Design a protein around this ligand. Structure first.
Ligand SMILES: O=C(c1ccc(F)cc1)C1CCN(CC(=O)N(Cc2nc3c(c(=O)[nH]2)COCC3)Cc2cccs2)CC1
Ligand SMILES: [Zn+2]
Length: 199
């Protein structure tokens, strides 16, 4: 099954991920409505996710994508946030649960943007305990994942697509939203447990 590797705060790895999480905070059109109001996370712990089977599907899909894209993975580390993280680290991303660019699995370069989703679309009703979307008490989680974009399609309006266009493997949707339509194309590498910190 899935085991979690407990990175150390003094790990050059750990540090690299918190810096990506910390440096990609930004302001959002909703004025902090969904994700709450903060300038910085209090990173409780960072964990590397290890799953035999998920690595295998990810590796296998990696080859097909490659053959169809001048033999390049075109992989990327992107943040994903969801109320579904527990199932994702245990069974991987599932497009059968899959928006502005169709029935896909969404990622983004800004940790803050994924933060909006940890309690659901538009932040839902905030933490279960304090019903607070800006809650500074409750621990949140997100994922820094390896994503196989393959040959990306670029959409510029909103479109309801089920799969990437032929010859493509992902959709970059315009801030850009990274969308794949196959779970295998993302592995959930880093489980991040954190708090938003009152400014
Ligand atoms: O893989 C999935 C899964 C796996 C296992 C399981 F048990 C249940 C689902 C699903 C597949 C559909 N996914 C769509 C999705 O990612 N949603 C949230 C979301 N949207 C965006 C970003 C982000 O970080 N998270 C970042 O960019 C902006 C869009 C949109 C959302 C829909 C519902 C809640 S958030 C959400 C996860
Ligand atoms: Zn709370």
């Amino acid at each position: 099954g899935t085991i979690l590797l407990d990175l150390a705060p003094e790990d050059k790895e750990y540090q690299s991920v918190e810096e990506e999480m910390q440096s990609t905070i930004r302001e959002h059109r909703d004025g902090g409505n969904a994700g709450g109001i903060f300038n910085r996370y209090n990173v409780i712990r960072i964990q590397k996710v290890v799953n035999k089977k998920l690595r295998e599907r990810f590796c296998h899909r990696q080859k097909e994508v490659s053959e169809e894209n001048h033999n390049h993975h075109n992989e990327r580390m992107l943040f994903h946030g969801s109320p579904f993280i527990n199932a994702i680290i245990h069974k991987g991303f599932d497009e059968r649960h899959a928006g502005m660019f169709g029935a896909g699995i969404y990622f983004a370069e800004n940790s803050s943007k994924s933060n909006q989703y940890v309690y659901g679309i538009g932040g839902g009703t905030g933490c279960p305990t304090h019903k607070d979307r800006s809650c500074y008490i409750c621990h949140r989680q997100m994922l820094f994942c390896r994503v196989t974009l393959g040959k990306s399609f670029l959409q510029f309006s909103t479109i309801k697509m089920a799969h990437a266009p032929p010859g493509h493997h992902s959709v970059i949707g315009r801030y850009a939203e990274y969308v794949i339509y196959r779970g295998e194309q993302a592995y959930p590498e880093y489980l991040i447990t954190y708090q938003i910190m009152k400014p």
